[PDB]
Amino acid sequence: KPKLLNKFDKTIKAELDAAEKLRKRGKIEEAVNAFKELVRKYPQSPRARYGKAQCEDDLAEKRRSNEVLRGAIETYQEVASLPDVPADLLKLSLKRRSDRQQFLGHMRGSLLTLQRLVQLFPNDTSLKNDLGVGYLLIGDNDNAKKVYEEVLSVTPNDGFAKVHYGFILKAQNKIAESIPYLKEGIESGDPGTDDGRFYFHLGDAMQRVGNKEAYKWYELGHKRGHFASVWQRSLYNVNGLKAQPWWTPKETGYTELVKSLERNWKLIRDEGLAVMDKAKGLFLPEDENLREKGDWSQFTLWQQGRRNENACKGAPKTCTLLEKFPETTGCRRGQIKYSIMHPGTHVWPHTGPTNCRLRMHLGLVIPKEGCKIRCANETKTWEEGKVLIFDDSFEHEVWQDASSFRLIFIVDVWHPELTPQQRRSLPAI
Amino acid sequence: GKCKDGLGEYTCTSLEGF
Ligand SMILES: O=C(O)CCC(=O)C(=O)O
Ligand SMILES: [Mn+2]
């Protein structure tokens, strides 16, 4: 179907097919020089230049190299600068340049490529969509909101634009507004609406309004391969890992870490209380929209495997103790943090992002009544000087209805069945 | 913006190349 040969490229069509054939055969080295010869002899051929660009692309994948891939990205832009580029070829070339610039994290760059695709093709809705994604990738939810509004002002039936529209509304805590969009969009069946994120957030938005349909959708998404179960709905998983809401210390193998936490708990407690008395701002309010009501704040010492050096100035002995346990200080999918919660607080049901961590809680200051935590079907209480362990990739929930503050210490560990090699390579969360 | 306790961000990992 797609017509990629302007008038002059039709007269050299035999040489261009010759060279693209070598490329399809796998001979990356042969074709790249066959396209570079064509580009030398035909410096205005948009099809020679695209062939060069694609061969650079295949290479940077044979080679897993970032410098050559960066070259393919300029060659893709070279295609669009030439005279008389056929439209199918100009779109294809610049889309790939955006998609491979997103792969490097040049998302400031992928953004400009996408804006140009939309200037050049103002009736293509897919490119307004793909540009909404460019805005979400860099955290610019405001500009992404307009984009999907515009798309919806023109095509209100477009699924993709609807789910993304909802996703934005949910993230803004416009929970009920979010739900028809999330629902109709998943229901459209358009390409790119069958994504776990939308199943996840429709069910969660239903739960918060008290619509008991919410688990119908958790079950749909389980059917279609997004969640491991209806209860355990994390999205950045390593498939297979033993899955259970509550673990005993021995079942994790981290008995040394647990012993240390429990034997040295009072120095951990005392540095946290010192930080509450003299250095409160180190405690930051929870900021993932997880509270229905009340006050909940966290003082973080490690995140994504990296010690916070200024934070460790306010808990120096605790940081020194934990340095001996890399199963937690190098868990690049978890944190190490004090967590304070006061009366009047209800944490919505919610799930962590990854099944690659287990979460330990050490009780530091626990009132006798009013504080409890549910993971899955079972609710439990903290104790001062004692560690509980649960998989926060399962749905969990917390209440604080006591008459003073409740303080715990939270230590994330690598899932025990994860290999040394998985631990070193998995991308941070 | 990061995914610490939940899944509220469009993507939780950061693309940084090969
Ligand atoms: O501080 C708390 O009680 C809440 C912790 C929570 O939701 C978690 O530990 O994943
Ligand atoms: Mn949690």
Residue numbers in the entry:
A (entry chain A): 330 to 758
B (entry chain B): 99 to 116
What did the original publication write about this model?
Aspartate/asparagine-β-hydroxylase (AspH) is a human 2OG oxygenase catalyzing post-translational hydroxylation of Asp/Asn-residues in epidermal growth factor-like domains (EGFDs) in the endoplasmic reticulum. The human 2OG oxygenase aspartate/asparagine-β-hydroxylase (AspH, BAH, HAAH)13 is highly unusual amongst human 2OG dependent hydroxylases, because its Fe(ii) cofactor is complexed by only two residues (His679 and His725) rather than by the typical triad of ligands (HXD/E⋯H) found in other human 2OG oxygenases. AspH is of significant interest from a cancer research perspective, because its levels are upregulated in invasive cancers (e.g. hepatocellular carcinoma and pancreatic cancer) and it is translocated to the cell surface where it can be used as a diagnostic and prognostic marker. Thus, the combined crystallographic analyses reveal that the C3/C4-substituted 2OG derivatives bind AspH in the same general manner as 2OG, with near identical binding modes for the oxalyl-groups and the C5-carboxylates.
Evidence for an induced fit substrate binding mechanism involving this conformational change has been described when the cosubstrate 2OG was substituted for NOG. The significant conformational changes in the AspH oxygenase domain triggered by substrate binding (ESI Fig. S10†) do not affect the observed mode of 2OG binding in the active site; the binding modes of both 2OG and NOG are very similar, both in the presence or absence of substrate (ESI Fig. S9†). Whilst the oxalyl-groups of both 2OG and (R)-16 bind the metal in an identical manner and the two C5-carboxylate groups are superimposable, the C3- and C4-methylenes adopt different conformations.
